[model samples]
Target: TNLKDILADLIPKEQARIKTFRQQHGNTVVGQITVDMMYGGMRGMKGLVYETSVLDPDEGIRFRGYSIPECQKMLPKAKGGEEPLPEGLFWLLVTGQIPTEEQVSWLSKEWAKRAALPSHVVTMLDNFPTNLHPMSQLSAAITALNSESNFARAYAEGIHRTKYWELIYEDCMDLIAKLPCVAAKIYRNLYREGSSIGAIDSKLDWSHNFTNMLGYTDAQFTELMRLYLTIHSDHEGGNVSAHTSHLVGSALSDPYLSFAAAMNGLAGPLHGLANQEVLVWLTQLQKEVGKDVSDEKLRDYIWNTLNSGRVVPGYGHAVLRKTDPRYTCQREFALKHLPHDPMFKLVAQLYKIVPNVLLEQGKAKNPWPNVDAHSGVLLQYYGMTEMNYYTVLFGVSRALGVLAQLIWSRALGFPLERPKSMSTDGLIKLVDSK
Candidate 1:
């Protein structure tokens, strides 16, 4: 039997889990904080903001109830291989189990099948000069792909909302698969002098192609891809990208529209975009200082960054205080592969210094590196230095997280997702009058 057949085999089981989780957590108001009502460094924020999924940050990220390591153990591996491929992470996200090897193979084939972008999409990218931010190119390209979505067309035809789910699923699968091709195209067009490197070997898995398409031929670079894909794949559902996708999907806006919306959120400098910011900051630091800095110097920089009224781009989180284990996982990969790389040493120094400052200031909960902190350096070392295009790679890997939440959303018939809000005066009056 083929891998698709195997995945098709497990759909019913995946659906069941989704149904059960929503029943338990839906409408269960955990607590309330405040939304960032314009500025204030996004501190002391609360409210039941709906997103495709939610990450508890410090508790470890959960997508539809599966833990990261749990998903790692359960997801499918490459053909005849023992380790779970990041593509398998998508399978697990959508279906709620580690897929069989055959199931993962089917996903690879399905994604590989949709790898080509419409020429119109490539032509659309021509509007932006190489000087434009790559995120702008990525967003424009994704929005263009959104037009190719069958789900949106079907919705316009007035198909019942229930049926809209499947089309959303299809578009999600297609868009996620096509991101690499689009991203690689962007690289080839801008950074590679317009020569195409194409995708990686079929045996290489998802992350491998991500690096391969960027012109890194060394086989050792595969681990960086592996770590990159695995860690950034999901960070719960609330942080910008995941939350934005969920909020949009709540209306049953097919996965393509929803995931694209989430990508827009990831474009924020305070969110997924921070990875690029860190790299740019460091590269500029390297240029300015003319040599590597010590952990003590990094400590001073951390304090200076904090005292300057700016949140450390990759340091603190709204939720995590213990360094993200996700970062730990990526750090493990860096230690093994690029340990000697100067930037890696810098990251190591910053990692040690940043958390201490944040803890002292009480502003940073998990002063540990978020996934973004370490990723840019690794990608840079491997030749994918277009930091602006970084999140497209993230969007590709994130297919598993958002799509998984969608599968769960539909399985349980999650409602239109309305949460109650109160006016500040009303709250004040109620308390004061009482």
Candidate 2:
């Protein structure tokens, strides 16, 4: 069966499971909200539901209960490709099962058919300012696609609410399919010498065509794109991007609009920008201490940065308390493929040094390096060195998780999100009363 049919079969069973669980335990308090949490951007707030993946403080992200290494082992890889297919990952995210090679290939063709951009989207991208950030262009281009939204049109025609998920599912597939083309266009137009982007190769998987559109034809880079996109796909729903998608989607916004909102959140400096920041920080460190600097020198440089009131970029995570497994996987890839690359070598040195320094400094709750710490150096080593465009790649990968959850949100009839709010004075009065 196709993914849609497979999901159609499973949704009712999952819905019934959720209903029975809620009936038995709806009032059980999963967490308490403290005043500090209320003011601290709701940090650690257990407020939303996401089905595609979850994050563990020690274990990093699990897509549909499969850890990175597990997915690496279990998901079907592209033929002759060592990296797991993002298509396989998406099937798991949507249907919670590993897909056969035939299923993965079916999805690849399905996405390829939906992959063409609207001519207006292409013209809009062409007319965008070269100085505009690629993320901005990406979000704007995504928002513009709302003109063709099937859900919006269907709703306007008074389609029954029960079918919302079906239409949303269609939009999600279409949007995910086309994102590579849109992102690669922004990359080529802004950074590369040519304005022309490559057409989707029907023979290539989604990420391979993404690299192809960005004009990298090397098969190894294609493999890296597949691995990069799959691992970065999801890290649970509390992240800014995932949360924004859910929040917008709760209002029944079409997948394109919802995802575009999410992309804007991902564009923030503390969020998806970390990958770019990692490379920049490393480059600055390289300039300060020569490429062959020793561990002691690296340690001193880290202290200098910290003493200057700067948190080391990519060294700490808000959630993960161990070395991120995502970082570990990428480091493994680097060790196998580009071990001698100078930036990677620097990352390797810093990996050995930074966590130990952070542990001794006693400021960080989780001192281990995160996915961001390694991703930029790997991409730079692959010659895709335009740092500003990094988050667009993140947005593309992230669409799998966010959009998958968006479908479930509609399917499960999750309500519009309206958390209670209190003014600062009201909060103080409540504290005084307490």
Instruction: Please report, as a residue range, the 10-residue window in candidate 1 with the lowest summed lDDT.
Output: 34-43
User: Each candidate: what lDDT?
Assistant: 0.68, 0.89
Alpha-carbon RMSD of each model: 4.5, 1.7
- Model 2, 107-160: lDDT tens per residue? 999898899888899999988888899999999999998887999999989887
The numbered model that scores best in lDDT is: 2
Candidate 2 residue runs with Cα over 4 Å from true position: 303-310, 429-434
Query: What is candidate 2's CA lDDT for residue 182?
Result: 89
Residue runs of model 1 more than 4 Å from their true location after superposition: 1-58, 63-84, 157-161, 197-204, 284-313, 356-365, 415-434
Location of the lowest summed lDDT over 10 successive residues in candidate 2: 192-201
